[PDB]
Amino acid sequence: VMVNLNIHNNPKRSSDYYNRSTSPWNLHRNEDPERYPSVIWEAKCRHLGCINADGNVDYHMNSVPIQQEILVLRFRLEKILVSVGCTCVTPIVH
Amino acid sequence: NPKRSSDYYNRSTSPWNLHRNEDPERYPSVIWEAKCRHLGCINADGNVDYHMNSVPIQQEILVLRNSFRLEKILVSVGCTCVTPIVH
């Protein structure tokens, strides 16, 4: 069909939860020139455990990435999974 | 629906509920958004602890709204637990 398109005019700088979380994370740049957007920032949990009240890595809990299914352009529309940040999970549910 | 793909929403120390955001003039029509269940986080004894806060992790995502426009929208994907003491 006739598309008559018109042209119109880093997470570290937007949010610091990555550093303040009990399940902190680092942000890694995933580069791909054949994909739009070219750069995708992905969260990687710093520790296996979570940071407890005393400031130590506690292995009674785990840091886990929160992933979101997002559509990307490569043209072909593809579904990709990206880590947005980390949360802390425990084996006891209250 | 994220409940069928992942259950971290129920197992997290900063658990969350998923709310349906409906818009017929937007594609996708339905967007599931995370809402933190508590202000505090669940501690070692199973109680809501107010020495820490549950906070949403938001992601900037592009959405579609004869004429269409690509718009940037912010959505909560899940919650994390933050404390006022950084180690």
Binding site: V3, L5, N6, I7, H8, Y36, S38 | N66, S67
Partner: peptide
């Protein structure tokens, strides 16, 4: 049919 797309997307197409 009209589709309002940003400048960064059009540059990537062409």
């Amino acid at each position: 049919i009209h589709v309002t797309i940003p400048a960064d997307l059009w540059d990537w197409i062409n």
